[PDB]
Amino acid sequence: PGNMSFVKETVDKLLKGYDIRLRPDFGGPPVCVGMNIDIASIDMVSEVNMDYTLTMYFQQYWRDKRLAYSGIPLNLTLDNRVADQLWVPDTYFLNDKKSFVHGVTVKNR
């Protein structure tokens, strides 16, 4: 019943004052980003182009103390627009030639 307002204000309290610019524990010890990949498929492998095309689900885990909450026991899934309101690691693929994130109906985040 009142959970909706409770969780809304919880999330607002988390984001209010949150700075995108600063990584977790800025100035302190480094943040540990754990990663998983689930390979969907490998597309053409090209000798002529000396490349291959890969499609995958790519996941990253880290802990940010600024986002801790206690009133709600749920693992809270949020609409993907929140990613623009949070710090996320700048991981990039050093040997890629051309790549894109999928957006079939909404951007796949």
Partner 1 sequence: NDNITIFTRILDGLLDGYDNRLRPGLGERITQVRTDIYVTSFGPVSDTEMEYTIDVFFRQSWKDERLRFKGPMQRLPLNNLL
Ligand X SMILES: *[C@@H]1O[C@H](CO)[C@@H](O[C@@H]2O[C@H](CO)[C@@H](O[C@@H]3O[C@H](CO)[C@@H](O)[C@H](O)[C@@H]3O)[C@H](O)[C@H]2NC(C)=O)[C@H](O)[C@H]1NC(C)=O
Other residues' Cβ atoms within 10 Å of the Cβ of residue 94: 4
23 contributes a contact to partner 1 by CB under 8 A:
yes
Burial grade of 103 (CB within 10 A; 0-12, 13-18, 19 or more):
exposed
Q: Does the annotation flag 53 for ligand binding? A: no
105 contributes a contact to partner 1 by CB under 8 A:
yes
Question: Which of a second copy, partner 1, ligand X, none binds 75 (CB below 5-8 Å, type-dependent)?
Answer: ligand X
Joined tokens for residue 71: 């009133």
11 contributes a contact to partner 1 by CB under 8 A:
yes
Angstrom CA distances, 73 to 8, 12, 50, 64, 70, stand at: 14, 17, 49, 17, 7
Kindly give, in sequence order, each residue whose CB lies less than 8 Å from that of residue 69, ignoring residues fewer than 6 positions away: 10, 11, 14, 76
Query: Least separation, in Å, of the C-beta of 71 and a second copy?
Result: 13
Contact region for ligand X (CB under 6 A) — 21-29, 30-38, 44-52, 73-81? 73-81
> Binding residues for partner 1, per CB under 8 A?
1, 3-4, 7-8, 11, 17, 19-23, 25-28, 44, 50, 66, 74, 77-79, 81-82, 87, 90, 94, 105
Instruction: Name the binding residues for 4-aminobutanoate.
Output: 92
